[PDB]
Amino acid sequence: EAAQAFENLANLEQEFGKAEIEILKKQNELFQPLFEQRRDILKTINNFWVVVLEAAGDEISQYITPEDSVLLEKLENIYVERFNEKEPRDVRISLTFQPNEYLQDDNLTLVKEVRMKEEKAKDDEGLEKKITKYTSQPVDIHWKPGKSMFRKNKKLPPNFFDYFQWTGEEEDDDFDGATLTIFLAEDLFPNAVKYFTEAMTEEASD
Amino acid sequence: MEAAQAFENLANLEQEFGKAEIEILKKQNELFQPLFEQRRDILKTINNFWVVVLEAAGDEISQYITPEDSVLLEKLENIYVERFNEKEPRDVRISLTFQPNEYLQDDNLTLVKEVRMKEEKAKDDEGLEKKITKYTSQPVDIHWKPGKSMFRKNKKLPPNFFDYFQWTGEEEDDDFDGATLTIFLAEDLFPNAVKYFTEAMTEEASD
């Protein structure tokens, strides 16, 4: 009865998937007003987000050059919105900057929209397999003259702002934007105050 | 400017996040528990389901699984994770049900680990309290057959998978991170078990 068991498991997986979306929607509906209120507070705390970004671990620091770091000193807020009603896992990530030497004033909010799609591809046996793909349109940033931080092309080591050019649509790119999206949306953004408070306690200890 | 007010307002908000999280965990348990129960009755019929899952779920588990562990786990018929404390959805009862085997006495074929939570405060070096979540658990005595105990007796041996049952979370000396394993089992391995099994069953050879 292996055949009947596995067919029943596949039916049940569909019900797990519907429950999961239901829970994610409920979670977003409860957390959304709290993240909005928190956003308005964090906007007043200078250098809050650069402290958080530098305390979050290798997942972020692997990308941060010290030129990244001086621009991030002007970062005023990170906000993560689950903007897609049918898919709670889609995120729109907004980085709001104060005026600075890298960005034109008309592009002080950098907005990245990442969409999550369950797709299918045949393996070497010939069977379809379910894969989760995160994809995103590239974001043109209106850099001030000579201050771009987009890679000329995809051999030079990536810095943090190359994320805005990551699309997820190239089995050629070395920049793992899916893992960075998940880290930003599920770890760094929800735990930001803890990261900041821990970094402050930690740095005054020395 | 006005940082004292900002950080006081953030602390009030953290309390509301905490209450929201508990509500979401309760809702999650009420939606998923009946599906985990139906799934449990199916999985008991599938040979080697859980040993394959344990070995395919990533380094967090496989760092503990030795070949002697693995032979016993072939007899594992089911893993179940129950959020048994209605007011604290994060407490878990993790049950491993075995078929008769050469390691466990027949009167001890279900291994039950209960892991509870303490939200507690500890002083940092300045003297301020900090909120920490601690997992703790009673040690579980297992009735091993002669010569087949899989408990280490001291800390020169690296812990193996069954050392989890002796982990208490109450010891500063410990190298065994049972809290991270508890969270992994309850939130990653158990909800995703069929996917892990199916991916293992579709793995290709290395040559």
Side-chain angles (χ1 to χ4, degrees), chain A residues 1-100 102-206, chain B:
Chain A
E1 305 227 45
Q4 179 76 237
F6 286 109
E7 299 166 25
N8 289 357
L9 289 178
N11 295 152
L12 201 48
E13 299 237 271
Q14 298 299 298
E15 309 177 31
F16 278 108
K18 304 331 113 194
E20 173 70 353
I21 290 188
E22 179 177 348
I23 291 296
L24 291 178
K25 287 183 181 164
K26 164 42 62 146
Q27 178 173 74
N28 174 63
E29 151 179 320
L30 285 185
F31 280 172
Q32 181 187 28
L34 306 174
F35 281 134
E36 284 165 9
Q37 300 172 233
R38 192 183 75 162
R39 171 201 64 207
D40 302 332
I41 299 166
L42 295 180
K43 185 166 74 136
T44 73
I45 305 171
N46 65 108
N47 279 28
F48 176 86
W49 283 107
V50 69
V51 167
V52 165
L53 287 163
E54 287 169 6
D58 298 343
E59 176 49 29
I60 300 279
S61 81
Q62 63 179 326
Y63 300 117
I64 296 191
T65 67
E67 204 155 36
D68 280 351
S69 197
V70 59
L71 174 52
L72 290 170
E73 300 276 312
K74 292 297 176 182
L75 186 56
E76 168 184 296
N77 237 328
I78 300 180
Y79 196 65
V80 177
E81 297 172 79
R82 295 175 185 278
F83 70 96
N84 184 338
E85 287 303 324
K86 320 190 181 180
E87 184 42 80
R89 282 165 294 210
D90 292 359
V91 291
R92 166 160 76 226
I93 303 176
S94 301
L95 270 62
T96 302
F97 289 88
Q98 291 168 349
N100 63 81
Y102 300 76
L103 300 174
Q104 296 282 4
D105 287 4
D106 71 351
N107 189 24
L108 289 177
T109 302
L110 306 191
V111 179
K112 184 65 155 170
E113 294 199 336
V114 189
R115 286 181 188 264
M116 174 299 283
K117 184 67 199 110
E118 311 271 39
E119 311 243 351
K120 289 172 198 216
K122 289 186 171 177
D123 66 11
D124 295 316
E125 171 104 1
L127 306 167
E128 306 279 352
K129 290 187 59 182
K130 296 181 180 188
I131 59 89
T132 302
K133 241 208 159 162
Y134 294 83
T135 58
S136 176
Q137 291 290 304
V139 183
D140 202 10
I141 293 176
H142 191 199
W143 305 101
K144 285 184 170 166
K147 304 283 206 163
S148 169
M149 288 212 164
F150 286 162
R151 287 187 308 197
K152 312 198 297 184
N153 72 111
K154 305 94 169 175
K155 289 130 179 313
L156 280 319
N159 79 92
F160 172 82
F161 291 98
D162 290 315
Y163 178 55
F164 292 89
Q165 283 289 291
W166 164 82
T167 66
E169 302 282 18
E170 327 183 52
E171 316 83 38
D172 162 82
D173 199 345
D174 55 335
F175 193 111
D176 184 5
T179 298
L180 177 61
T181 305
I182 292 162
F183 181 79
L184 290 175
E186 295 179 11
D187 191 337
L188 183 129
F189 180 72
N191 297 315
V193 179
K194 293 137 159 268
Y195 280 122
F196 179 89
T197 306
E198 166 190 9
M200 290 301 96
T201 294
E202 197 152 297
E203 152 156 44
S205 285
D206 314 328
Chain B
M1 204 136 42
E2 324 200 336
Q5 182 80 71
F7 286 109
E8 297 167 23
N9 291 176
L10 289 175
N12 299 152
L13 259 181
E14 299 256 81
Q15 295 298 124
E16 306 195 294
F17 279 110
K19 286 161 196 169
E21 265 151 340
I22 294 307
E23 179 176 349
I24 289 151
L25 292 177
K26 290 182 181 165
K27 173 48 158 194
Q28 177 177 73
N29 176 248
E30 93 178 288
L31 282 187
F32 281 94
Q33 187 182 27
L35 306 174
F36 285 140
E37 283 162 8
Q38 299 174 232
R39 191 181 75 163
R40 167 159 64 169
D41 301 329
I42 298 166
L43 297 177
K44 81 201 324 308
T45 71
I46 301 171
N47 172 45
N48 270 244
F49 177 85
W50 283 109
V51 69
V52 168
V53 163
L54 287 162
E55 288 169 7
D59 295 343
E60 175 47 29
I61 297 278
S62 77
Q63 66 180 326
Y64 297 117
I65 298 190
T66 64
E68 194 167 29
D69 278 354
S70 194
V71 172
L72 175 51
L73 291 169
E74 301 171 15
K75 288 293 179 181
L76 185 54
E77 169 185 297
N78 239 327
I79 300 191
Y80 201 68
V81 178
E82 187 197 340
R83 296 174 184 277
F84 66 94
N85 188 336
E86 319 73 62
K87 53 92 177 153
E88 181 42 82
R90 285 170 298 211
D91 294 358
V92 290
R93 165 170 314 130
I94 303 177
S95 302
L96 268 61
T97 300
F98 288 86
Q99 290 166 347
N101 63 78
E102 297 181 354
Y103 296 70
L104 302 174
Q105 297 285 7
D106 287 359
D107 71 351
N108 192 192
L109 292 179
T110 302
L111 305 191
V112 179
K113 182 65 154 171
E114 297 201 340
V115 186
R116 297 214 189 221
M117 299 219 163
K118 300 184 299 184
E119 319 208 63
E120 203 264 10
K121 324 192 259 207
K123 288 186 172 290
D124 64 14
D125 297 315
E126 180 143 274
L128 304 180
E129 309 279 59
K130 284 191 152 60
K131 296 181 180 187
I132 59 89
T133 39
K134 202 140 150 301
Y135 291 88
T136 58
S137 177
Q138 291 290 303
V140 183
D141 203 9
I142 295 176
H143 191 198
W144 305 102
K145 289 189 174 169
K148 310 285 293 189
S149 171
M150 308 280 98
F151 285 167
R152 68 184 172 158
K153 318 229 273 197
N154 61 46
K155 310 321 186 192
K156 291 124 63 200
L157 245 188
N160 76 87
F161 172 84
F162 290 96
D163 288 317
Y164 180 55
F165 293 88
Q166 285 289 112
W167 167 82
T168 68
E170 300 282 19
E171 72 291 62
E172 319 161 26
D173 44 48
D174 203 343
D175 54 336
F176 187 84
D177 184 5
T180 299
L181 179 64
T182 302
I183 294 163
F184 184 82
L185 288 177
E187 296 178 11
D188 190 336
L189 183 132
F190 185 72
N192 297 315
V194 179
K195 294 140 153 146
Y196 284 126
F197 176 87
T198 309
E199 292 292 347
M201 289 300 109
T202 53
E203 284 178 25
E204 312 184 1
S206 293
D207 59 316

